[PDB]
Design a protein around this ligand. Structure first.
Ligand SMILES: Nc1ncnc2c1ncn2[C@@H]1O[C@H](CSCC[C@H](N)C(=O)O)[C@@H](O)[C@H]1O
Ligand SMILES: Nc1ncnc2c1ncn2[C@@H]1O[C@H](CSCC[C@H](N)C(=O)O)[C@@H](O)[C@H]1O
Ligand SMILES: O=Cc1ccc(O)c(O)c1
Ligand SMILES: [Mg+2]
Ligand SMILES: [Mg+2]
Lengths: 239, 242
């Protein structure tokens, strides 16, 4: 995966019933409200080999709306890539907000870093080039309740979401939000079997079918799976 | 529509969905919505599915989305415009704290009394002040009576589709700064995606033209930030800026 695209199958599949409907949403409601630096970051990223992993613009405004409605101040971003969702979070947070951004590939982050800097929000970002799980485990033993996160966006290795979940249910405050990206996996999760996939795509597809069942039965959180982008599952920590 | 006007016979969009397949929608509902649906919401939905205007019912996956927004923003005083049998109203009452208060407005209280037994069994009727009237006269009277200390945290708009713009001009002053106004059906079964659309009854066509104007207007409204979400039949969240 990101971190070749020639071998993947689902990258061009929609979950909406037509390209024209998605194009309407983006042109009517998303692009007119997209920050100029988000537009620049998106446009260079669409030329990249792994542009299919890019968080779409309509989902980005949805993430920003969640952040502002819940008055988020300290967040964690797992899976940065070129930094579209990271820049979305940094622009939504107040001037003194803080983000812990984790990704195994900092070179991806440096593609979007000039746009993050021009938006004047780089100071809010503490980027850590590493695999997410050791970072989350290190946090679990250093984290005190005063520094729990308000918000967590999970968008890294798809087969590792369940492992991320067991850490984040303790790293996010009570009432905070944990968001999992791609939980519908281009709609491929709607069937027990789905032919024609790359082996990595099938691993992710099975991982999401298991995760969606688990999150629906997890009493520690309340959930809401949203049919936006590639599917986003919002979980709110109950206790 | 359900409030007044044409029959359900003349509606042509009711069986469509904005997702690429009913199988994907069925998966979302069976995996993520129904296992989290309150027992009284399930009962309210099941009796509403047999009503003539079942197509106007807020789906279960969107219901949990509305409930999540209410809790993440810590809403306490909300206004519900367009009640029908009360699925979205019961979702709100269950999500709010026990001292939460809702102003619910609908032109037809008979619809509301269909779901009232489930609201009462849930034990949250004490949060609801139901007003049987057209929404706009109630909203206009509120603006003359509303203290700034009494501004609403959250508004759900789901009444006559052709009148959303008039509701908007009132609600941007009835909801607090940083509060949420939510407009339902802003995608109108995908029919808003084209300038012209064939074969719609006048009520459905006027609503389609109204949503196309509203979506363009809300995207240019400096009083709010917006987020159009492709859930249900499209929900546009607006957060008041000033
Ligand atoms: N084990 C791991 N730990 C941390 N990051 C990982 C990881 N495995 C993959 N990733 C990263 O997760 C990213 C997924 S693409 C994420 C897209 C991004 N959220 C956006 O807004 O567009 C890739 O950049 C990849 O480098
Ligand atoms: N002008 C008006 N003022 C107030 N309510 C109206 C109205 N015009 C129509 N309505 C009501 O708005 C409702 C739309 S159906 C709303 C569905 C409901 N929110 C749910 O959760 O399922 C109808 O019941 C109709 O009676
Ligand atoms: O009036 C018809 C209608 C159809 C679908 C809806 O979601 C709704 O609120 C109303
Ligand atoms: Mg993703
Ligand atoms: Mg509706």
């Amino acid at each position: 995966g990101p971190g070749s695209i020639d071998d993947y199958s689902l990258v061009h599949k929609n979950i909406l019933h037509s390209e024209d409907l998605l194009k309407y949403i983006l042109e009517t409601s998303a692009y007119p409200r997209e920050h100029e630096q988000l537009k620049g970051l998106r446009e260079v990223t669409e030329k990249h080999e792994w542009s299919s992993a890019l968080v779409p613009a309509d989902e980005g405004l949805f993430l920003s709306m969640l952040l502002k409605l819940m008055n988020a101040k300290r967040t964690i971003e797992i899976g940065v890539y070129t930094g579209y969702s990271l820049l979305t979070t940094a622009l939504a947070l107040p001037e003194d907000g803080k983000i812990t951004a984790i990704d195994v590939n900092k070179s991806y982050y440096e593609i979007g870093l000039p746009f993050i800097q021009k938006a004047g929000v780089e100071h809010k970002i503490n980027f850590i080039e590493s695999e997410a799980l050791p970072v989350l485990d290190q946090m679990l033993e250093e984290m005190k309740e005063e520094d729990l996160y308000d918000y967590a966006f999970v968008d890294a290795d798809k087969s590792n979401y369940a492992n991320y979940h067991e850490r984040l249910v303790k790293l996010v405050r009570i009432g905070g939000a944990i968001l999992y990206d791609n939980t519908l996996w281009y709609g491929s999760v709607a069937y027990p079997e789905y032919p024609g996939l790359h082996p990595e795509e099938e691993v992710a597809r099975l991982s999401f079918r298991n995760l969606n069942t688990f999150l629906a039965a997890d009493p520690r959180v309340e959930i809401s799976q949203v049919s936006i982008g590639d599917g986003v599952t919002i979980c709110r920590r109950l206790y």
